[PDB]
Amino acid sequence: IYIEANTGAVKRVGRSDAYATEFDLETEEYVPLPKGEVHKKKEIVQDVTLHDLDVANARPQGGQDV
Amino acid sequence: KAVVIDDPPLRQTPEPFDEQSAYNPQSPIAIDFGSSKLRAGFVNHATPTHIFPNALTKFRDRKLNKNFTFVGNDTLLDQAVRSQSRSPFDGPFVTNWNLTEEILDYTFHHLGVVPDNGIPNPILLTERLATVQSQRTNWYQILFETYNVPGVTFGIDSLFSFYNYNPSGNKTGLVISCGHEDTNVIPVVDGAGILTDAKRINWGGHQAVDYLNDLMALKYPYFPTKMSYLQYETMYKDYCYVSRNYDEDIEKILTLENLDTNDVVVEAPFTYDWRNSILHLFLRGPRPHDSENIHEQHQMHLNVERIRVPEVIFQPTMGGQDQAGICELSETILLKKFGSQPGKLSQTSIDMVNNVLITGGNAKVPGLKERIVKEFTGFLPTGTNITVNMSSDPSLDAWKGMAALARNEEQYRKTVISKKEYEEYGPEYIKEHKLGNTKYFE
Amino acid sequence: TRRHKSARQLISDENKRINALLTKANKLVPKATYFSVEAPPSIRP
């Protein structure tokens, strides 16, 4: 899985490579383990204009999903 | 350039006898009845006096005197005496017994001992894990009737090596052994071998050499020369190592950039492109083959079996038995026993992690320590300090452990067995000491 | 005098001795037998 703690985003990547031999044919995709650490920290700088903040609060239909 | 494989050479010099002047009746004697090699030596020394495999045979002459009692190292004199060699071990147990006291009398004669009415030296002896009652019973009978010895103890070789490598006696660690026919995982808590959570794996060096024998027999069904067991254990010793990660290493083991490096050819003693053929790469490596010259018909290639054979202790499924590999039993010992939630380690768990020891005669293969450290960093929570210790010669450590218990400490007399105690209690007895077997029930 | 006493039947005699002691005590929890240190099957496929 993929957990972003600040936003709350949940993303599923797939089943592990260790569970690839429970069936000969399966409908799931098998990925290897992530080679890095579980917890990673990264500093970012976000640039937005005033027009993006205007258009984010002025949706006539409503908000959209991710 | 090809290398030829021969039988190991015969020992020219016969083994000597210890001097009878320096023998001490009060000095204890330590015997390790190992499956592959027999280790013996007096307590006062630290170097092994007599090292020879536990095998023996009988000879027949033309002149008919019946004077042949050859045991062990004197079978390393000719091919004919070595070929008919019979060992007292049948599987993990001992079935025949006359050859056992014949071997023990050979050992006692070569120790330079002149006894009277039996041996007046106490015996330090090594015994297996969860041993059956018949073996303990006839061990009791055989020593305390044939040899008239005052005192004996029982103990496991892995716990003996653990007592060797931390002689305080109250430490905490995890000991994994790779014996001749078995692989054992024992957790030690405050110096006590916790046998209610020990585990045993039915694989050893002998089964690995037999696996290589069956694999190489099934790879080349038209080999004109039949190979012996000894050539097999030497190409198992010389050309086998443990992979860092199996799944990546098998995926590129027959690749041309990899097959030019780790392909080992073996010469038997005697008197539509092929490059895209995975079968031809698996048979004869990266070289073209012509089956008319005599030399390459006696040739034998080792490409995938360099790491396929030592892997099976980590996955016993290709060996045939339906058991887990030492990764999983080490993981469940470290993570679901001795009061450990998965995620939170107890102090006993952390102290076992910090003192992991691996012994055994089959640990001579390279890459064991790197693999075990890598996977211990794998399944454990992050930040946990893992320490794994290794011996230079791990087949010496158990006899040194019992020698340490004898010479180093004075509390060895806690664990001894008296003859009068044997006669008041009987064969059905076990001392619940810190370093050997326990009672079968509660 | 002793029989040849091959290592295959020793397992059977130890198993039937343990089972007989178990059914005699029933009509004792084992702690360290040859059939309890032997490894459980794996969980990973």
The amino acid present at B75, given as its one-letter code, is T
Q: Which of B361, B359, B408, B369 is nearest to B177 (CA)?
A: B359
Residue B275, token pair as written in the block: 């490059």
Q: For residues B26 and B286, what is the distance between their CA atoms, to the nearest angstrom? A: 64
Q: For residues B58 and B61, what is the distance between their CA atoms, to the nearest angstrom? A: 10
Residues from chain C that touch B129, judged by Cβ atoms under 8 A, are 37
Q: Would strands B199-201 and B264-267 be described as parallel, antiparallel, or unpaired?
A: unpaired
Residues from chain B that touch A40, judged by Cβ atoms under 8 A, are none
The beta-carbon contacts of B267-272 under 8 Å, at least 24 apart in sequence, are: B267/B2, B267/B3, B267/B4, B267/B5, B267/B295, B267/B298, B267/B299, B267/B300, B268/B4, B268/B5, B268/B223, B268/B225, B268/B227, B268/B298, B268/B299, B268/B300, B269/B4, B269/B5, B269/B6, B269/B225, B269/B298, B270/B225, B270/B294, B270/B298
Contact A37 B247 (CB under 8 A): no
Contact A17 B247 (CB under 8 A): yes
Q: Closest approach of chain C CAs to the CA of A20, in angstroms?
A: 8
Q: Which of B304, B307, B306 is nearest to B254 (CA)?
A: B304
Q: Closest approach of chain B CAs to the CA of A44, in angstroms?
A: 26
Q: For residues B268 and B235, what is the distance between their CA atoms, to the nearest angstrom? A: 12
Closest Cα in chain B to A34: B378
Contact C29 B442 (CB under 8 A): yes
Q: For residues A19 and B36, what is the distance between their CA atoms, to the nearest angstrom? A: 39
Beta bridge partners of B3: B266
Sign of CA pseudo-dihedral A48, A49, A55, A56: positive
Residue B100, token pair as written in the block: 């056992």
Q: Closest approach of chain B CAs to the CA of C8, in angstroms?
A: 9
Q: Are B417 and B378 in contact (CB under 8 A)?
A: no
**DSSP 3-state assignment of C9?**
helix
Q: For residues B277 and B274, what is the distance between their CA atoms, to the nearest angstrom? A: 5
* Chains contacting chain A through 3 or more C-beta pairs under 8 A: B, C
Q: Are B171 and B164 in contact (CB under 8 A)?
A: no
Q: Closest approach of chain A CAs to the CA of B247, in angstroms?
A: 10
What is the phi-psi region of residue B169: left when phi exceeds 0, alpha when psi lies from -120 to 50, beta otherwise?
A: left
Contact partners, residue B201, CB within 8 Å, separation at least 6? B182, B183, B184, B185, B313, B316, B323, B325, B326, B329, C39
Q: Are B397 and B391 in contact (CB under 8 A)?
A: yes
Contact partners, residue B207, CB within 8 Å, separation at least 6? B181, B319
Residue C45 to residues A16, A19, A24, B317: CA-CA distances in angstroms? 12, 7, 12, 10
Q: How many CB pairs under 8 A join A and C?
A: 5
Residues from chain B that touch C32, judged by Cβ atoms under 8 A, are 130, 195-196, 198, 437-440
Residue A16 to residues B244, B253, B365: CA-CA distances in angstroms? 19, 23, 30
Query: How many other CB atoms are found less than 10 A from the CB of residue B82?
Result: 19
* Helix extents (H) in chain A: 50-56
Angle at which helices B326-336 and B368-379 cross, to 10°: 40
CA triple C16-C18-C21, angle to 5 deg: 105
Sign of CA pseudo-dihedral B346, B351, B354, B359: negative
Contact partners, residue B72, CB within 8 Å, separation at least 6? B15, B38, B52, B53, B54, B55, B56, B103, B106
Beta bridge partners of B201: B183
Task: Calculate the CA B281 to chain-centre distance.
Answer: 34
Residue B372 to residues A39, B309, B310, B358, B367: CA-CA distances in angstroms? 24, 17, 13, 10, 9
Q: For residues C5 and A59, what is the distance between their CA atoms, to the nearest angstrom? A: 88
Sheet bearing B50-53, strands edge to edge: B50-53, B37-42, B29-33, B123-125, B152-153
Q: Which of B205, B194, B188, B154 is nearest to B357 (CA)?
A: B188
Hey, is the C-beta of B200 within 8 angstroms of any chain C C-beta?
yes
Residues from chain B that touch C40, judged by Cβ atoms under 8 A, are 323-324
Q: For residues B430 and B140, what is the distance between their CA atoms, to the nearest angstrom? A: 11
Q: Are B111 and B83 in contact (CB under 8 A)?
A: no
**Of C7, C39, C44, which has the smallest distance from its Cβ to B90's Cβ?**
C7
Residue B256, token pair as written in the block: 């041309």
Hey, is the C-beta of B383 within 8 angstroms of any chain A C-beta?
no
Q: Closest approach of chain C CAs to the CA of A29, in angstroms?
A: 16
Residue B391 to residues B243, B368, B388, B395: CA-CA distances in angstroms? 20, 12, 10, 9
The amino acid present at B407, given as its one-letter code, is R
Residues from chain A that touch C42, judged by Cβ atoms under 8 A, are none
Residues 117-146 of B with CB under 8 A from C: 129-135
Three-state SS letters, chain B: CCEECCCCCCCCCCCCCCCCCCCCCCCCEEEEECCCEEEEEECCCCCCCEEEECCECCCCCCCCCCCCCCEHHHHCCCHHHHHCCECCEECCEECCCHHHHHHHHHHHHHCCCCCCCCCCCCEEECCCCCCCHHHHHHHHHHHHHHCCCCCEECCCHHHHHHHHHCCCCCCCEEEEEECCCCEEEEEEECCEECCCCCEEECCCHHHHHHHHHHHHHHHCCCCCCCCCHHHHHHHHHHCCCCCCCHHHHHHCCCCHHHHHHHCEEEECCCCCCCCCCHHHHHHHCCCCCCCCCCCHHHEEEECCHHHHHHHCCCCCCCCCCCCCCHHHHHHHHHHHCCCCECCECCHHHHHHHCCEEEECHHHHCCCHHHHHHHHHHHHCCCCCCCCEECCCCCCCHHHHHHHHHHHHCCHHHHCCECHHHHHHHCCCCCCCCCCCCCCCEC
Beta bridge partners of B41: B30
Phi, psi of B390 (to 5 degrees): -140, 145
Q: For residues A55 and A50, what is the distance between their CA atoms, to the nearest angstrom? A: 9
Q: For residues C45 and C42, what is the distance between their CA atoms, to the nearest angstrom? A: 8
Q: For residues B78 and B41, what is the distance between their CA atoms, to the nearest angstrom? A: 27
Q: Are B380 and B388 in contact (CB under 8 A)?
A: no
**How far is it between the farthest Cα atoms of chain B?**
81
Q: How many CB pairs under 8 A join A and B?
A: 3
Residue B119, token pair as written in the block: 């041996």
Residue in B129, B440, B442 to test binding to C, most C beta-carbons within 10 Å: B440
Task: Calculate the CA B317 to chain-centre distance.
Answer: 21
Q: Closest approach of chain A CAs to the CA of C42, in angstroms?
A: 13
Residue B18 to residues B50, B73, B176, B332: CA-CA distances in angstroms? 10, 16, 35, 49
Q: Are B232 and B209 in contact (CB under 8 A)?
A: yes
Q: For residues B105 and B134, what is the distance between their CA atoms, to the nearest angstrom? A: 22
Residues 15-44 of C with CB under 8 A from A: 44
Residue B127 to residues B35, B49, B82, B155, B381: CA-CA distances in angstroms? 11, 20, 27, 6, 36
Q: For residues B382 and A38, what is the distance between their CA atoms, to the nearest angstrom? A: 9
**Of C8, C10, C40, which has the smallest distance from its Cβ to B134's Cβ?**
C10
Q: For residues B138 and B122, what is the distance between their CA atoms, to the nearest angstrom? A: 18
Residues 19-38 of A with CB under 8 A from C: 19, 21-22
Hey, is the C-beta of B405 within 8 angstroms of any chain C C-beta?
no
* Technique that determined the structure: cryo-EM
Q: Would strands B173-178 and B356-359 be described as parallel, antiparallel, or unpaired?
A: parallel
In angstroms, what is the C-alpha Rg of chain A? 19
